[PDB]
């Protein structure tokens, strides 16, 4: 599945970014996505936290164009 | 590609146009227009430049932008020419969401000097255009943008 895509709906967009906030903020409990560490933790740290959305908003602004953490 | 969608909530995104010299320092207005009552919560928006025409030296967020210290960010991919701007009421409780018409962002930019050079015309224009636009509110519906692209009309220095 795709990294970064929490709802996975295939894409990394904006509605990732607002549910990856909820989700660190507890305001949602889970992802609608399965595997909350593979998709949420695109840095590979195993952690997934404000690193992350951090990572989340430098793609979207395409500071980056890939996460750290990768499928290969 | 801005994706052709349908959705149940809609705004236009303008730019707004300048008429200007070259070599002058310029603000150009980018709007929001029609914009749902019940609020956006996040946006992400990229626009494309002429490098040969215009330099980009700033980019500041609009009144209607809330909380912007925390809610609204841009990059320059300078290698692209391109400006993406990113929106989202932080705190996610609702309390800044976007429900105003009127200016989003202001880009500051330079027209450049010599734009006329090898040139017999004392009248330019240059287009500002968009990329992706992905908007959406509190409960992650999608809102479309209907975006209008814009122009600086560009006058010949003397
Ligand atoms: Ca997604
Ligand atoms: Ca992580």
């Given at each position: 599945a795709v990294i970064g895509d929490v709802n996975a709906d295939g894409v990394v967009n904006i509605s990732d970014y607002v549910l990856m906030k909820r989700y660190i903020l507890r305001?949602?409990?889970?992802?609608?996505?399965?595997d909350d560490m593979w998709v949420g933790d695109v840095n590979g740290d195993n952690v997934i936290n404000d690193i992350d959305c951090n990572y989340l908003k430098r793609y979207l602004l395409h500071m980056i164009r890939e996460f750290p953490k990768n499928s290969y | 590609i801005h994706e052709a969608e349908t959705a149940d909530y809609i705004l236009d995104v303008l730019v707004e146009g300048v008429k200007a010299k070259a070599g002058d320092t310029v603000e150009i207005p980018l709007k929001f227009e029609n914009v749902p009552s019940h609020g956006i919560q996040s946006f992400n928006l990229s626009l494309y430049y002429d490098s040969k025409a215009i330099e980009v030296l700033k980019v500041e967020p609009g009144s209607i932008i809330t909380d912007p210290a925390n809610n609204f960010d841009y990059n320059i991919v300078y290698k692209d020419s391109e400006i993406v701007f990113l929106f989202d009421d932080?705190?996610?409780?609702?309390?800044?969401?976007?429900?105003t018409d009127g200016v989003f962002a202001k880009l500051t930019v330079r027209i450049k000097?010599?734009?006329?050079?090898?040139?017999?015309?004392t009248k330019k224009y240059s287009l500002i255009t968009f990329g992706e636009s992905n908007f959406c509110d509190f409960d992650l519906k999608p809102i479309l943008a209907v975006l209008k692209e814009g122009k600086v009309e560009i006058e010949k220095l003397e």
């Open positions: 305001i949602i409990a889970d992802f609608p996505a399965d | 932080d705190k996610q409780k609702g309390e800044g969401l976007i429900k000097p010599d734009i006329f050079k090898d040139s017999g015309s």
